[PDB]
């Protein structure tokens, strides 16, 4: 009913977009002050990697349950409860005594639990208020808040820490705006209507689809590399710059760089695939594979330039991020091309789960574990801390090359999978 939509849809879209910005502003505030967290709690590289692994595991487990409860109960109540759920906990976790490291890990788990609800439920509301023509534009406006919040995380954390003089203050700002958004959503968002079944046949059919499996494994590789680098880059840059005796501007510059690479990579990928589709019908997997194999080379050069000059490292980071973030708007098309319309709702929900299981659930912890394992076998000094983190961070190009190989294997079966899908659909109806 447009009669109330004339105000409700605009107000809801704006407030939910700001909610998404606040949602992503609180995942990367800890990555900005990881060095201070380590120096205060007195821990090592093994335990400083749990603070993102626990978050990701909790998000993994708690997303499908909220995705199910979102179509039995009132959605505004759940969104409001989650908002404060992830807010109040974030605020309360800044008073922890020095002897209680594990309590911070528990806090991060609870924050992840709340963010799962928000990020699973909000798109459904923002997509049930609009018709066939303007749903896509509003969804894009919702989605184009990931890079902005991601950069604002580093920038806010570093700036507040430097200005206040105590790292605790980095965790005491976003709850104030969360407590406002969680009240404004109760006012500006109109109520939206809600809504033996077997999903074993869906699984049994999806397992024998080679393109689907290979694309899922490639997405897992992308998640691995993205999580590891996004958590462990700024600390490595700081250590390297300390080694040269030429030095928190690193977080500022990294946030500024990612805020632009996020848009640039997606635009480049979309243009390239639109050009390529008119030459051959294997365009999407080949474009993705070329992107991965061209991003691995520029990723691998950070660890060589960082020993001699910093500006080269920044340029390599720019190019690597730009090429790596050029296959986030293509994989959904590969999924839609070879999966019949009745099995898509399952085939997405499964894939996301897998993308978190083989990907960024255990990657930062693995990097920290390998770093300490290498570190304990040699002398203790800043130079070996730098070289240890550098040598640990070399597993990412290997995984990226594996992802490229999987995209090629997808391009190998793309056409046969399409033909089978068409025969299935025309036999159903």
């Amino acid at each position, epitope marked *: 009913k447009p009669a109330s939509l004339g105000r409700g849809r605009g107000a809801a879209a704006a407030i939910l977009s700001l909610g998404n910005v606040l949602n992503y502003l609180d995942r990367y505030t800890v990555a900005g002050v990881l060095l201070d967290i380590q120096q205060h709690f007195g821990v090592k590289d093994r335990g400083a990697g749990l603070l993102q692994s626990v978050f990701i595991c909790s998000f993994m487990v708690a997303a499908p349950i909220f995705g199910y409860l979102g179509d039995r109960f009132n959605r505004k109540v759940i969104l409001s409860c989650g908002i404060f759920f992830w807010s109040a906990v974030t605020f309360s976790s800044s008073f922890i005594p020095q002897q209680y490291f594990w309590l911070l890990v528990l806090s991060r788990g609870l924050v992840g639990i709340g963010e799962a609800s928000y990020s699973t439920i909000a798109p459904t509301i923002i997509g049930d208020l609009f018709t*066939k*023509n303007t749903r896509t534009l509003m969804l894009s406006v919702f989605y184009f808040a990931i890079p902005l919040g991601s950069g604002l995380g580093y920038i806010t954390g570093s700036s507040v820490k430097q200005a206040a003089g105590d790292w605790h203050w980095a965790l005491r700002v976003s709850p104030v705006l969360g407590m406002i958004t969680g009240t404004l959503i109760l006012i500006l968002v109109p109520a939206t209507k809600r809504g033996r079944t077997s999903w074993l046949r869906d699984m049994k059919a999806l397992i024998r689809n080679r393109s689907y499996v290979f694309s899922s494994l490639a997405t897992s590789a992308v998640s691995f590399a993205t999580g590891a680098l996004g958590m462990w880059i700024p600390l490595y840059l700081h250590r390297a710059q300390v080694v040269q005796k030429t030095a928190a501007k690193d977080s500022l510059i990294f946030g500024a760089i990612t805020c632009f690479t996020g848009f640039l990579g997606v635009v480049t990928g979309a243009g390239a695939t639109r050009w390529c*589709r*008119l*030459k*051959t*019908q294997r*365009a999407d997997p080949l474009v993705c594979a070329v992107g991965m194999l061209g991003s691995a080379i520029f990723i691998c050069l950070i660890f060589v330039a960082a020993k001699s000059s910093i500006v080269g490292a920044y340029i390599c980071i720019f190019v690597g991020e730009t090429l790596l973030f050029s296959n986030w708007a293509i994989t959904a098309d590969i999924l*839609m*091309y070879v999966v*019949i*319309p009745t099995r898509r709702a399952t085939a997405v929900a499964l894939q996301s789960f897998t993308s978190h299981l083989l990907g960024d659930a255990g990657s930062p912890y693995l990097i920290g574990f390998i770093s300490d394992l290498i570190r304990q076998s040699t002398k203790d000094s800043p130079l070996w801390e730098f070289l240890s983190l550098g040598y640990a961070l070399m597993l990412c190009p290997f995984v990226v090359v594996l992802g490229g190989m999987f995209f090629l294997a997808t391009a190998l079966f793309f*056409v046969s999978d*399409r*033909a089978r*899908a*068409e*025969q299935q*659909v*025309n036999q*159903l*109806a």
Partner: nanobody, 126 residues
Framework: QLVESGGGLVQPGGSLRLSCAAP?????????LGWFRQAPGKEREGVSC????????NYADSVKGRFIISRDNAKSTVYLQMNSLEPEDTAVYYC????????????????????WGKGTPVTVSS
């Protein structure tokens, strides 16, 4: 864009053969077929479509048994063969290029085609 051809003035009981072609070196293998039509006092509706790989055809309910669509990939052309025309077939006919699988109950939706033509009028006399 795509370029249409054919169409004219036909008497009742006649036949006519329309064609769409791609310009330049574009190939349009990924997917580019489906014929639509529009009348002076009605809305745009779908008439037929064919599939990318196997050659599977679907027609609307009111044209079954009369029209026949075909695809030729060596020349990048699509043909429609129209038989036993009636005074209710006066309209302007279009080609389109989209991405959704060829199936029934997919025809009538035309908000998700990527490429459109300009149309060629067909007038059935009396």
């Amino acid at each position: 864009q795509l370029v249409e051809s054919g169409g004219g003035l036909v008497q009742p009981g006649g036949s006519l053969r329309l064609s769409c072609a791609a310009p330049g070196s574009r190939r349009f293998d990924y997917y580019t077929l489906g014929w639509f039509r529009q009348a002076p006092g009605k809305e745009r509706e779908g008439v037929s479509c064919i599939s990318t790989v196997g050659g599977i055809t679907n027609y609307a309910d009111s044209v079954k048994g009369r029209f026949i669509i075909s695809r030729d990939n060596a020349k990048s052309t699509v043909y429609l063969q129209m038989n036993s025309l009636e005074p209710e077939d006066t309209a302007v006919y279009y080609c389109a290029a989209g991405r959704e699988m060829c199936a029934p109950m997919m025809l009538g939706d035309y908000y998700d085609m990527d490429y459109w033509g300009k149309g060629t009028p067909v007038t059935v006399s009396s």
